[PDB]
Amino acid sequence: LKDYALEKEKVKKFLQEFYQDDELGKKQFKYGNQLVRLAHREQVALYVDLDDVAEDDPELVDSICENARRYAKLFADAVQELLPQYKEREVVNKDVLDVYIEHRLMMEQRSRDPGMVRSPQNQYPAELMRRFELYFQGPSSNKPRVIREVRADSVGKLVTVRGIVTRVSEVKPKMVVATYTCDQCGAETYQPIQSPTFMPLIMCPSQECQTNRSGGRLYLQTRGSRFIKFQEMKMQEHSDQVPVGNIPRSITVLVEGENTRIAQPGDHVSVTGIFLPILRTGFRQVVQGLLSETYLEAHRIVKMNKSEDDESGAGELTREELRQIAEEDFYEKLAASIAPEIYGHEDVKKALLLLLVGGVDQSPRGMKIRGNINICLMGDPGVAKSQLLSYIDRLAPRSQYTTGRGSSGVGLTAAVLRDSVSGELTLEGGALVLADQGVCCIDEFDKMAEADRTAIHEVMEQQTISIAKAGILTTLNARCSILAAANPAYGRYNPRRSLEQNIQLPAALLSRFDLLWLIQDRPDRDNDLRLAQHITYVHQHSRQPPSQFEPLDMKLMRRYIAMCREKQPMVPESLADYITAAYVEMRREAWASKDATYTSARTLLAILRLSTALARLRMVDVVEKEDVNEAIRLMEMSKDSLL
Amino acid sequence: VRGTPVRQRPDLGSAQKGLQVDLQSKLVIWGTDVNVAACKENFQRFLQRFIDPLAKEEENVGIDITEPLYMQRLGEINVIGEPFLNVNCEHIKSFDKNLYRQLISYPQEVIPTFDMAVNEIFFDRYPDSILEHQIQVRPFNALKTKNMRNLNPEDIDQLITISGMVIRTSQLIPEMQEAFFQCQVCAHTTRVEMDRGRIAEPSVCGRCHTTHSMALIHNRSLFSDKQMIKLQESPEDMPAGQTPHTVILFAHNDLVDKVQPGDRVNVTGIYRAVPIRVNPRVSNVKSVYKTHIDVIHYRKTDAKRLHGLDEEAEQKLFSEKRVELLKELSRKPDIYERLASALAPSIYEHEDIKKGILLQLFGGTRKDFSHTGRGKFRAEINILLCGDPGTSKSQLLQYVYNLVPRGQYTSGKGSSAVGLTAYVMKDPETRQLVLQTGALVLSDNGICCIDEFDKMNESTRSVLHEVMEQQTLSIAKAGIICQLNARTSVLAAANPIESQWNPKKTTIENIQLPHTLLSRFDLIFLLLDPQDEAYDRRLAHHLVALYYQLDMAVLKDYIAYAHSTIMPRLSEEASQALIEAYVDMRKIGSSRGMVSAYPRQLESLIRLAEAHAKVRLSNKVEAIDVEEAKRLHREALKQSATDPRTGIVDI
Amino acid sequence: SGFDDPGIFYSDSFGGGQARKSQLQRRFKEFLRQYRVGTDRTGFTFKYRDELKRHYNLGEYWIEVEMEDLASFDEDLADYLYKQPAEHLQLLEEAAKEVADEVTRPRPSGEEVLQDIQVMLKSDASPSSIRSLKSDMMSH
Numbered sequence A: 001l002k003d004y005a006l007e008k009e010k011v012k013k014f015l016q017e018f019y020q021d022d023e024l025g026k027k028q029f030k031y032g033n034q035l036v037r038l039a040h041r042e043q044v045a046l047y048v049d050l051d052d053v054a055e056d057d058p059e060l061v062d063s064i065c066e067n068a069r070r071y072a073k074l075f076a077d078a079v080q081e082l083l084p085q086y087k088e089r090e091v092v093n094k095d096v097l098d099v100y101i102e103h104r105l106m107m108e109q110r111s112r113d114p115g116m117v118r119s120p121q122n123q124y125p126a127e128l129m130r131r132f133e134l135y136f137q138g139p140s141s142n143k144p145r146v147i148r149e150v151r152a153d154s155v156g157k158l159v160t161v162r163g164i165v166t167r168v169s170e171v172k173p174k175m176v177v178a179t180y181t182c183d184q185c186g187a188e189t190y191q192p193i194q195s196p197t198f199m200p201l202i203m204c205p206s207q208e209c210q211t212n213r214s215g216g217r218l219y220l221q222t223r224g225s226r227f228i229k230f231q232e233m234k235m236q237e238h239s240d241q242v243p244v245g246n247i248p249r250s251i252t253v254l255v256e257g258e259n260t261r262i263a264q265p266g267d268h269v270s271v272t273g274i275f276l277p278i279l280r281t282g283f284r285q286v287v288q289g290l291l292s293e294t295y296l297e298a299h300r301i302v303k304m305n306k307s308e309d310d311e312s313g314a315g316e317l318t319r320e321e322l323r324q325i326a327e328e329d330f331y332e333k334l335a336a337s338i339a340p341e342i343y344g345h346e347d348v349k350k351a352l353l354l355l356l357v358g359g360v361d362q363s364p365r366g367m368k369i370r371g372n373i374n375i376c377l378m379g380d381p382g383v384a385k386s387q388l389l390s391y392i393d394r395l396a397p398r399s400q401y402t403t404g405r406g407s408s409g410v411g412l413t414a415a416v417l418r419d420s421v422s423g424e425l426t427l428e429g430g431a432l433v434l435a436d437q438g439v440c441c442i443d444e445f446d447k448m449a450e451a452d453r454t455a456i457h458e459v460m461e462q463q464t465i466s467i468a469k470a471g472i473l474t475t476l477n478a479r480c481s482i483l484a485a486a487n488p489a490y491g492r493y494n495p496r497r498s499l500e501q502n503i504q505l506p507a508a509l510l511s512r513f514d515l516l517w518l519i520q521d522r523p524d525r526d527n528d529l530r531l532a533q534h535i536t537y538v539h540q541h542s543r544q545p546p547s548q549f550e551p552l553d554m555k556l557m558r559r560y561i562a563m564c565r566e567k568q569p570m571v572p573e574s575l576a577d578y579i580t581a582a583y584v585e586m587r588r589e590a591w592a593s594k595d596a597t598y599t600s601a602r603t604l605l606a607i608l609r610l611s612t613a614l615a616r617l618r619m620v621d622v623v624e625k626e627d628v629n630e631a632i633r634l635m636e637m638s639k640d641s642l643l
Numbered sequence B: 001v002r003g004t005p006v007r008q009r010p011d012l013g014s015a016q017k018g019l020q021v022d023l024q025s026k027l028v029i030w031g032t033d034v035n036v037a038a039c040k041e042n043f044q045r046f047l048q049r050f051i052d053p054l055a056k057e058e059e060n061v062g063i064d065i066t067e068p069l070y071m072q073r074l075g076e077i078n079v080i081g082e083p084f085l086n087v088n089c090e091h092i093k094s095f096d097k098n099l100y101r102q103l104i105s106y107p108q109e110v111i112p113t114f115d116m117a118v119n120e121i122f123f124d125r126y127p128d129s130i131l132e133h134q135i136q137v138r139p140f141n142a143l144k145t146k147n148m149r150n151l152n153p154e155d156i157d158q159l160i161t162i163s164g165m166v167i168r169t170s171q172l173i174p175e176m177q178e179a180f181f182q183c184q185v186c187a188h189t190t191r192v193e194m195d196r197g198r199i200a201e202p203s204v205c206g207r208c209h210t211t212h213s214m215a216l217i218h219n220r221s222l223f224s225d226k227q228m229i230k231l232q233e234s235p236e237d238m239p240a241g242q243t244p245h246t247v248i249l250f251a252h253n254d255l256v257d258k259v260q261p262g263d264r265v266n267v268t269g270i271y272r273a274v275p276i277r278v279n280p281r282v283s284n285v286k287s288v289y290k291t292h293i294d295v296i297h298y299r300k301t302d303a304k305r306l307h308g309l310d311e312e313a314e315q316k317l318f319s320e321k322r323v324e325l326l327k328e329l330s331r332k333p334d335i336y337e338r339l340a341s342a343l344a345p346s347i348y349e350h351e352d353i354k355k356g357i358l359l360q361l362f363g364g365t366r367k368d369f370s371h372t373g374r375g376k377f378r379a380e381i382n383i384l385l386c387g388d389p390g391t392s393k394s395q396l397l398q399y400v401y402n403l404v405p406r407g408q409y410t411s412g413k414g415s416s417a418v419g420l421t422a423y424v425m426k427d428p429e430t431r432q433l434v435l436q437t438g439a440l441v442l443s444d445n446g447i448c449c450i451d452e453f454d455k456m457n458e459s460t461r462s463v464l465h466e467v468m469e470q471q472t473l474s475i476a477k478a479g480i481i482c483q484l485n486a487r488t489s490v491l492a493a494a495n496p497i498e499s500q501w502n503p504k505k506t507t508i509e510n511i512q513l514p515h516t517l518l519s520r521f522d523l524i525f526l527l528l529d530p531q532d533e534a535y536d537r538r539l540a541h542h543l544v545a546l547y548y549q550l551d552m553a554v555l556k557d558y559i560a561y562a563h564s565t566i567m568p569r570l571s572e573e574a575s576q577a578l579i580e581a582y583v584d585m586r587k588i589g590s591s592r593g594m595v596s597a598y599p600r601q602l603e604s605l606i607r608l609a610e611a612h613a614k615v616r617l618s619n620k621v622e623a624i625d626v627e628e629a630k631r632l633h634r635e636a637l638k639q640s641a642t643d644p645r646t647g648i649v650d651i
Numbered sequence C: 001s002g003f004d005d006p007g008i009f010y011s012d013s014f015g016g017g018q019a020r021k022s023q024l025q026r027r028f029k030e031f032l033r034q035y036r037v038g039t040d041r042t043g044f045t046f047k048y049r050d051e052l053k054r055h056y057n058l059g060e061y062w063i064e065v066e067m068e069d070l071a072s073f074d075e076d077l078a079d080y081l082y083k084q085p086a087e088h089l090q091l092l093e094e095a096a097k098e099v100a101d102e103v104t105r106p107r108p109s110g111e112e113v114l115q116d117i118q119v120m121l122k123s124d125a126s127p128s129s130i131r132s133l134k135s136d137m138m139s140h
């Protein structure tokens, strides 16, 4: 229907004279600069934002979104033609593929014969000599689609979907152009690969071996060939977009090139790409017809909404965030912003913020002490333990939420599972691995299987998982902080029994928890009325009642916490005696009493990492005495409910 | 070259085209930036005059001022018969940075040039030396790739160094190198070498001119050895959420059978990408390739580990200066305490646990009871750490795990019985069922650290009985019947019943392990918490000081020397001391709820005394060794604090 | 992805007693380009180069090659043509096509596709008898 020479001129015109004031208001050619950067081989990926294209040619954006594979090819053609005139120096040949490109180009010039018309097969395939790769960023005027509803009517179209990443293969080399050499001639043979399989060539087709009518067997080699970083992921529907009685649907996303190594399993992502078929020929197909599988050829992969990425590299922000972080009540404001719909539990929220920020990991002369804070909320029924855990799951960047026994066994640990790219046995992690450097919220901790409690022992202290079962012999790597929620021994605290007889945790597991918080709800008229007013306001308006400080948005909380995270403070010597005295005093009162939990050196280490976290929240580089004071006070408030 | 055969190198792959291209319209290889002449001359310049100006130790030949480090190595290759030169890539990096960049980038073109250069230099001198083949260079110690998941398709066919633990090694695979043919008619024979990975069958005999009468005769052909190795990588960079990685290695001709399962090794080789067929019976290949390493070099040395068995058995591991220094250390009155204190330096005053672990690292005297009908005697020392939590048992187990070669770490319910002994899987590269060893066999000459020993069901803890008694693992499974070797030391850590020591219960009631299993351990260290304020203060200072601010190499070499040369034997007065000690300890342990002594504790004492004599580099077990064995055995179990009626109190 | 197939591509043969037919064809091309007739006094002309030019530009697409010219310029090529005319005339005609291409280049539009050149060939040798066509002359 349409003429692609004119479309190529259109996309050339867009690339050459589109400008924006992004550089601090200075008017830059957004894509000409990148053509410069990738003509000098300083850049590989060119993300063509289609919002930019739509500013001056919405019909082009419609055509792109309707074919989306013709236009990716057109854009690659156009940029490849524009690169020579944007090259202002000579590339340093940073790579080994670059040497092959340079030798091929130089040989082609050397035997040029510019006026002689060479065969269509006597040329280098375009894909063999590109070194860049071009991707679309979907127009924002396209509303994201739901994985279930991306069907045959959108094959070939550019669509945007979002879901949880459930499974990512390892990055492995996918052949793009298979290069062969001959045993007779000295020409190279190229076989661009489009299918998932290919039959390697046997005889060479070069001009010399045809003239000579020689054998000319050709040999497949990796050295001149083109591979691309390839990776296959499975992405899954979000829970709040599944039909009522249904399970979430998956989609295969084929990720190649510079989009690899972005998504990890557990990530919430938005993927823009072309919905494309794979011919699926070969089977003993029941039905006649050209049936095919489907996949999303990823163009843009964006983590989001709990695993947001770009803010991390954008730590520089407004003067405001400077002024709130500088404020003295910043710690109180961040603590209050944790689940504002839950009323009360101010100190619990302070401790939870400490778990999110965490302490500093020590590595002294090969004896690792982990800076993770593990917290257990040992509480009465209906005191909002699960709500706090679910909130912390929605907040923390790498967080997995686990209730009683749905995620038991290999749902926490790893399992060996078959792959598809290589058909061998890959290792897949469970909740403790999917939360490797984040939080794992274990709800109903007390009703957990004993094997899983043992695994949690070894995770909490050594921060690994040792498996020596039949198919698996590995030490997984689980650097997570455990946020546990449990009920006392008989579902409710019994003041007639002893504290550890209510906790029903062994001393070893009880010591694994830096802060173990008792939450009792004794009735009382004033506090019950206040709690009821808060709850009824939340029901009435879907928001917490207004207070003096507006709670921070969960994006701001993530950014503030992440900005705190890279702030390793050191305990000074001037605090050594103060900390030691606090620990000794705490230790003495532990056995002076008859209603105290197990206390050990881990209690000191808990003081020390809690105070390090508190110092970190103030963005200081040394721990002060107020941090140690706040750590001590939180440690007493953990059991304050007993009084 | 002296007419000496130049054997092919399967580790470099099949030869390529090797096209020479002139960059002027100087003579580089096509697709590379190397010309063979300048590379050869650069490497000759390197071999002739390279001196390490910073390294002086563990040479044992290296004059290390004498202008060649490497032509000293050539002299060794003249003295011994082995035609291999191991070149440290860091040396090339120092000498010629561009040559190093060329080597790791085009090893298949640069290493054969290095081979020619080395043989030219070697046969310049030593011109009457005889070698079964010309010298093959083996570059090692390239820039370590910390995580092999970080490797890109840009890295295919380059030289990389990685580290990990050998998990499985295949049987030796014969690879054809030169085919032999006879005519079915005239019996004329011919030979055809591999050319780019295939053999061109003669198809007409040159004698009787019969078409297609030459037949390949497999057992007159020439073959090379190949071996597949599963190596579990040990990345230094472990990004969040990344599971452990198994990499395929292929060893050839001489690196075959050079590593055993459970060995920790640095492997240098070529990163290869290979096509996968869609079925074994078709020639279509997938678009997505799989990767392996073609092994060039195995490096067993690790700075942070102890010497492995292959190293310790090597005769020239120590210079005379080193041996004299070690012996001078052995003459120190408190070498025992110094070596013990060098262990886990970050752990505060567990001096007796550290002495026991030192004795475990030294071990008792290997004995050949074969002519006595007795069986095999366990020379290994098995330590159990039982104590209430937070007392740093897992830190000690982690330290021993991270220090020994051939170690394994197991915790709690994560291991099974067949996962510790052995099981059958199906190798997904051959589609064949192969037998895989478990944790207890991978530590066959090392220490298996079992953590949360108590939180570990009796099914898998029965497997430990035969390992701890007879150092063997007899498996009678469906088809496979054998006796795997499991000569492991066991370092176990366990909690008491109720997870905290309670003083109202006796020692036996409180450890709560089967009483036959406790006799297998030759030290039970009771890591109990005294409710002591002074210790609280001292430990608190150690731990806080840990938040702001004896060598290892000497310890490593001391232990290696003791394992190599010292074989303590019981003296007569040591014999008598042991008799008396056993009788006394049996009187003592026959009390109410104490860990009793069986004839097995006499052998425990013998092992501890032999290990202690070995710490002294003694070669003769004397009364002092037995005295320290008794003392260590009593201090563990706190038998001074134990009354013959009840439990213990405090020290 | 399993639907299309691009072609097979190849490059020029960069790099690298009985000469291969490519080399013989190259020597035929050299003979056609560089066989010079005349003397410096009367000037030199390249007989077959300008004969190809003239014939092609007229639309003829053939040339007449004298076997003595070939024998003088390259005696081995002439021996090949006499012993094995079938394959070496294919080489010579392919050479003529190339030379005509590079002497008529560029051509007016409509004449874009290059034509096959028939190489008729003549000699000054005396003809042999039709009775002498025995079996030893087959394929010569």
Ligand SMILES: Nc1ncnc2c1ncn2[C@@H]1O[C@H](COP(=O)(O)OP(=O)(O)OP(=O)(O)O)[C@@H](O)[C@H]1O
Pocket (backbone or CB within 6 Å): A341, A342, A343, A344, A379, A380, A381, A382, A383, A384, A385, A386, A387, A388, A486, A487, A531, A535
């Ligand atoms: N302090 C509170 N503020 C606001 N809402 C609360 C509070 N306590 C309980 N709720 C409400 O009560 C409901 C039950 O809370 P939740 O399920 O978190 O209890 P729980 O602590 O998990 O109890 P269990 O120990 O039985 O699991 C939630 O919907 C929550 O909104």
Ligand SMILES: Nc1ncnc2c1ncn2[C@@H]1O[C@H](COP(=O)(O)OP(=O)(O)OP(=O)(O)O)[C@@H](O)[C@H]1O
Pocket (backbone or CB within 6 Å): A367, A368, A369, A461, A508, A509, A601, A602, A605, B346, B347, B348, B349, B350, B387, B388, B389, B390, B391, B392, B393, B394, B395, B396, B494, B495, B539
């Ligand atoms: N004597 C000590 N020296 C050094 N560090 C100690 C000592 N006691 C306790 N610690 C510190 O306290 C923590 C104790 O945890 P560790 O896992 O080592 O104890 P454990 O005995 O394994 O506990 P459990 O019996 O619960 O498994 C470690 O971080 C350790 O560094």
Ligand SMILES: [Mg+2]
Pocket (backbone or CB within 6 Å): A385, A386, A443, A444, A485
């Ligand atoms: Mg709940």
Ligand SMILES: [Mg+2]
Pocket (backbone or CB within 6 Å): A461, B393, B394, B395, B451, B452, B493
């Ligand atoms: Mg432990």
Ligand SMILES: [Zn+2]
Pocket (backbone or CB within 6 Å): A182, A183, A184, A185, A186, A187, A204, A206, A208, A209, A216
């Ligand atoms: Zn060819």
Ligand SMILES: [Zn+2]
Pocket (backbone or CB within 6 Å): B183, B184, B185, B186, B187, B188, B205, B207, B208, B209, B210, B213
């Ligand atoms: Zn024959």
